[PDB]
Symmetry: D2
Subunit: 441 residues, 4 copies
């Protein structure tokens, strides 16, 4: 038969852990991913989150405390029986914050694979002679992701024809940043708890008495289980919780993004307007003038403000804190999983039975075409560049004003137009610092 | 590795043809389908649409006219090359309206498969002795679906322990119906164009590959209607391949608009029509399995299930669907609501106390094998709704049917067949040929 | 990307339980299943095994004794924890031998599904007027499979245009049989141990997790027999999960040995038994569809299909299978030969000339949906065998049945039912209850 | 339901093109891939073929000639319609022989992915402090594969703790080689033709008249289509041929291996005995003495002689040249596809209900456990080390004698015991030479 009648994607745990675990393709609306007939991509502007990593130091501290309670007791029973032959996956505390480098979901493998992939898809946009600059925010795991992606794309010519430019995450950069700063609630008050965690705590304690696990330990043990895939092919800890518990966990993580780095915080659109507006400039200037390939690397919390700025994936009302709002668009596993990315494709199209010859804008989020709301008149439900321009011009909030940015800091982004072509930053030249975070190499 | 990183379900054409083609499992929110730990289903109330069928007579007329234009020209080229060795799938015009009986997607096979399946899942709710009445609306394809489902469920004991009760589709039945009537003294549905820009691209591409057909955007619509129905009789359809992924996305949406406005939230009277079933089933839930019975298998149409969903206030778009463009992401995706053989199953859960709930009765809704959370009432095990809350919500929100629908005072004002039925098995097996284009029927 | 790099089919438990569990498509060599370009099937001769069933009475007795030991002990631990909420799937002992009627793998659902499927594939071979006789051996579960297949294929016209002919399994039928008899005046089969080392690992692991059952390697064998049969009545089996992948690999092989030696090439008389069908069908192929008829649907047992494969000289291990270890990679993998509902379909192809063959008649063999090349005779389109060569090969290699099997001269020496049959439809529907443990039957 | 009833793996084109195309997991007998309960791997000896590459210069010449005939004619029709918007995938002739670096099947991505994978599976065999040498035969694409695998496995410590040793392919190395030489028929006479190629030629010519394609052009166009995946995610050329044509093509390629580098040539077992015997030595010495990780890289034609030497996957009779011998064990897509590999795992097992405590040998070919014929008495159908030793000692042919190896050449392999720990060869330091073949860097 032609089509399968089973539809099981929704059950995947990959779509139920916020952005802690492995990358996954965003659920598609059914729109063909390749350029519509009569069109071709003439410019690409992408922002990819660092790949799969180890937990952060604070998350690791909490995971360790929960594991201490687990470990305070003879041979394990029930769903925790695997614990009799199991070792925590973080080599040592200095690895917290770093990209993973083992298993099918390794973060560096993610970046490399994505680069090789984009080479086939957009190779036609590089003549094999030009030196292409690529950009990374100044943070270890992000830089390492950028490096492996660039190496995947440029391959044999990575050393000579790709030029890594690292942009400081310091606020001093103002709007000339991949990680804009904004200074002057619900986010601070999140409990990270939902009733299903009580069921898990009760079930775990009952199978192996003596751990005194709370709903809070459950939350951290699930954070732990979701990060395990980033370093290993399978996680037995994932199996110690139920499908319904994972559904609640993913939602707890969705709330964090929504309120701390999304539409739940009204200043996020202004932060995301920096990239939204600067990229609009590149689209309007065109590939011949500005360049055809812009590969950017940053964090999950830098992509969500862009989506907010663009007005896409905006829940109709703020997400409720005490229950799962099923079906809302803010499903983080389809927005910013490890290695997630927003790719803006500029399409050069000839006339079609539904559109005039011209330039169109197409958005792709994690391999799935994301229609620009009601602007879907061009080929493949794209948006005519002129309409796209009026929409952003009319709706993007002002960054410096909204964010009280010092008049002495750069007021607009320049790196896409003012960059270096040297290749010294392409390869790492020093060990990964202990829990390395901010970095410029 | 543990999980696949590819997510392709959204591309399936089965989710892009409204309710014309084969049945498909509804896209899941991830909630476990089986009863939560500490719970068990003690009562089941299901309403299933007839299985996969041939087009209706009017649709067939249109399909045939479009095919005449296709056929008005030497060996076919391009994507229509398969037409050189292809025959329309409707045996003859008398088959329009009937359930299909060939291929992996055959309508009767769907019903029988669904019955065998429910036997394993809910067999514990039948003691092997009781004679269980099951209900079908008075329409040929619906009756045939009911019969095959019942046979799948009761199996060796279908002729003795299942009792088919057929409920007339006539308005004279008032609320004692599986297909309540509502007078039309009150529009967007009548003005639907069934057109979107992508159809122009298809027409242009088809005409260019095989000149001389003069196919229009309308012919394309009907040719797509035809392609979607083909799967109902055959395992593969090459016609599906003659249109692009983007064309199918538009077609599915054109079909969603029909349901939305003709049989859904787009028509404000649909909630009242659906309140009949919603309220009557609420009565069975509150009465309980011991008193009322534990198994209620009902069979009707797609347009009988959508008003129930509207009545319950689930899958309600935030705003009426726009007619001129695809409103991507809206909940009204018909391939996940009423595909051929689609169904809404209400499970009553008897649960012991859990770390998050008291011992008690809970209500779970399952639409096409996917648990459908009752909006904000998700406090019970498996995101279910406490029976008491479920009761207040329906009592507070269900519109009045007879009032809203100006039902004659002389017609039944209440549904009774779930309590007043026959246990004879005389209607279990078909006893006459399928009439030409058989629609309304009582056998 | 275009193709997946993961190849997991080999791990499926469906391919590791001999013929006890659900039907599965045979592993393909990659040859296209549909008729080659320039060809079409003009005649079909199929023999299908009864669908998924409950264990036999003797197997059930053994399963029950093993379960008694399991049950001789407080709440279950480890892999047997599910036993705290589990009930044996055989309703009562009178169900042993019967076709299953619940779950996605239900035996009757299998038959009905297969029929609907063949309707789309071979419908063109029935003009909608002719009354087609179909044949079943005289055994309850086989008859019930035949009936459901026929109903799936003929659908709306099953009661009028299909004619079930039931052929007695008695030896008195001689060669005019779907289940020929062969006297046993002549062993390895009788001495099979049904044991392999992995069963010791299972027993040890099970006893250690829940002490007090004293399960042996034999109990493990029967518990695995039980687990494999569970799928026949239910969608999932937790018992399957209590054994390792390596244990299942050994179990499947223990089952392969049974067929090999009791009903296969391991017994030199099986080719002669299978020659009856092989030769009679060759006659139909040579006679042609116009004269003999185009559709021959036959239903029998797994042990009736394996002798045919032996007679045809296909899937013959290079050496007899070793009894003490798994001979990995040998062609005698029963899950790819006779799983529940398994079938051998002979398609006669009428082909025009192709760049590699002359216009003519070719013979194609399909085993469980996979084209099975006739050894070195693969010169026709789609690796088929020219009818003339097929004829010489069978004529030259098929053993003589009556001689080899010492068949009384007073019994039919030739199969005739394909030419001498009834067209009445009286046997199409079951008219009495399924007898307790119903085996031989003529209705 | 628990299991799918559809079994479609056999139809995959990945299993129907000899060793020209993308890597694929070998079809499994069902044996669990992980170490049996009571056992653990204490030593790994692997030989992996270079990853996906571009055709060789000679193959490329032929592909080009066939494409010239295709291109000798207005807009393309039928199955070749994609040709109206298609470009050959070899950048320029200097790329022939090289590893691919684009698409999901890129050869370097293959190596990197495999390394990350083995890190999770065998990481426990490296203490994070030791410098592990790894070996590659002296050939460009093989060296590049070795490098990316080593980088995947050692990750952050690749520069310091992995030491690439490159072994010359010159015959002068004698038995101290990953590519032993042997000098003094059916192989030379292979036609590379089967009737199905006539059907394709006839069908292609009929759809686009004027190309005058022969059964020979068809063969080369299929060689071309199979190599296309190595550089791109999809190949439309694959779709221009039928399933039955691909079945014949794969068999034509199987014949080549069988007769030119397999059991069809009686000297192949002697060539493979070098590795078979040397590795047996490592197994008998053990991990504590010899080392626990041996990652080797060579060619497809170096792995087939090892399998021949071991007596595994030996057809009961020589493959017929004029027809497909369906079901024979010599299915190259399950033996040596691009990046294929033979991994020997030494298992240290405690006593089980079926075996004594001890050392066992397990063979894994392309992720599938390959039982050692009738020696399957240990856990997971493994072979007791002692039995494995007697079998090889009793059956391996003599290399130097059989192959008339000069007494002045090394008579036994030494590199596994005599190697360097320097890391200079770890990273490429010069451009990829035009059609680079033999290389020592
Ligand atoms: C495989 O790859 C992995 C990843 O690349 C490699 O792992 C990395 O290896 C790095 C070493 O090369 C290791 O770096 C060490 O981390 C230590 C912890 O740092 C954190 O705490 C301190 C103190 O609070 C903070 O200052 C710091 O910012 C962090 O928050 C550091 O302590 C180490 O620093 C010392 O060593 C480096 C040189 O290696 C010096 O440049 C530095 O100045 C320090 O030297 C002092 O300490 C050393 C002894 O460690 C003395 O010998 C030296 O004389 C100095 O001692 C003075 O100060 C100390 C107190 O610190 C005091 O005791 C003494 O009396 C003196 O006053 C160093 O930075 C990475 O963390 C690690 N990354 C990961 C992710 O694990 C791995 O090595 C590779 N494997 C192989 C086999 O190569
Ligand atoms: C396989 O199974 C299929 C499905 O059951 C059978 O097909 C049906 O066969 C019946 C006949 O047995 C067909 O019925 C015939 O319909 C004709 C057309 O009916 C329409 O038009 C009339 C007149 O306007 C209306 O009255 C009617 O409501 C319909 O709108 C009728 O003209 C026929 O009537 C004649 O025959 C009957 C007796 O059979 C007399 O009573 C009449 O007086 C008159 O002389 C007849 O009723 C039916 O349409 C078919 N259904 C389908 C879906 O095709 C096949 O026959 C069966 N195959 C075999 C070999 O048995
Ligand atoms: C759902 O459908 C199932 C399957 O059809 C029905 O179950 C069958 O029901 C029949 C009864 O209708 C059962 O038949 C009974 O079998 C008993 C045991 O038979 C064995 O033992 C006797 C004696 O040694 C042998 O002669 C025989 O060959 C068997 O080996 C018989 O003792 C019964 O006989 C009594 O009743 C009949 C009339 O019904 C009289 O003629 C007799 O003289 C005697 O008084 C009887 O024949 C059958 O075994 C069941 N099959 C299965 C698989 O369980 C269910 O009944 C049906 N459910 C409902 C609610 O209808
Ligand atoms: C948008 O960004 C571009 C590039 O930094 C800048 O030149 C331009 O002034 C910005 N426009 C607005 C309205 O901020
Ligand atoms: C709901 O339906 C039941 C059954 O028909 C009926 O008895 C009851 O009166 C109805 N309730 C309301 C409010 O209409
Ligand atoms: C083969 O079977 C046919 C049909 O029964 C019979 O007529 C014929 O004589 C048989 N041929 C041989 C050699 O037994
Ligand atoms: C035909 O019917 C007669 C009478 O019922 C029966 O005896 C005979 O066995 C039937 N023939 C076949 C081939 O079944
Ligand atoms: C096997 O190889 C080892 C390592 O090179 C060598 O020492 C030994 O002599 C060889 N044995 C035989 C029989 O050739």
């Amino acid at each position: 038969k032609q089509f399968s009648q089973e539809f099981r994607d929704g059950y995947s745990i990959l779509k139920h852990y916020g952005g802690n675990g492995p990358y996954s393709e965003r659920v598609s609306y059914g729109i063909a991913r390749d350029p519509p007939t009569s069109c071709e991509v003439d410019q690409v502007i992408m922002v990819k989150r660092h790949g799969e990593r180890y937990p952060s130091p604070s998350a690791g501290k909490d995971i360790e405390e929960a594991l201490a309670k687990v470990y305070s007791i003879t041979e394990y029973k029930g769903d925790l029986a695997f614990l009799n032959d199991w070792t925590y996956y973080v080599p040592n505390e200095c690895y917290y914050n770093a990209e993973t480098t083992s298993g099918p979901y390794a973060g560096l493998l993610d970046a490399y694979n994505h680069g090789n992939d984009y080479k086939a898809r957009y190779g036609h946009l590089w003549n094999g002679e030009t030196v292409v600059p690529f950009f990374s925010s100044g943070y270890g795991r992000v830089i390492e992701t950028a490096r492996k992606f660039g190496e995947g794309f440029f391959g044999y010519n990575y050393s000579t024809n790709a030029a890594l430019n690292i942009i400081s995450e310091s606020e001093v950069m103002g709007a000339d940043s991949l990680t804009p700063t904004c200074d002057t609630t619900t986010c601070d008050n999140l409990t990270y708890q939902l009733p299903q965690f009580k069921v898990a705590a009760a079930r775990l304690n009952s199978q192996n008495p003596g751990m005194n696990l709370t709903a809070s330990d459950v939350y951290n043990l699930m954070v732990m289980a979701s990060f395990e895939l980033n370093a290993r092919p399978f996680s037995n800890w994932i199996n110690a919780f139920t499908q319904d518990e994972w559904v609640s966990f993913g939602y707890v993580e969705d709330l964090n993004y929504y309120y701390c780095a999304g539409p739940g915080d009204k200043n996020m659109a202004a932060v995301g307007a920096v990239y939204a507006n600067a990229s609009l400039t590149l689209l309007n200037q065109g590939p011949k003038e500005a360049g055809s390939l812009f590969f950017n690397f940053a964090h999950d919390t830098n992509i969500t403000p862009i989506l907010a700025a663009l007005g896409v994936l905006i829940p109709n009302e703020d997400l409720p804190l005490d229950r799962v709002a099923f079906g809302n668009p803010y499903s983080i596993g389809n927005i910013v999983p490890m290695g997630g990315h927003l790719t803006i494709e500029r399409l050069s199209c000839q006339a079609t039975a539904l559109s005039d010859e011209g330039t169109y804008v197409r958005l792709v989020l994690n391999e799935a075409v994301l229609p620009f709301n009601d602007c879907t008149s061009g080929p493949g439900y794209s948006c005519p560049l002129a309409n796209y321009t009026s929409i952003l011009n009319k709706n993007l909030p002002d960054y410096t004003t909204t964010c009280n940015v010092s008049a002495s800091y750069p007021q607009y982004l320049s790196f896409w137009w003012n960059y270096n072509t040297t290749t010294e930053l392409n390869y790492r030249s020093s060990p990964i610092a202990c829990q390395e975070g901010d970095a410029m190499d």
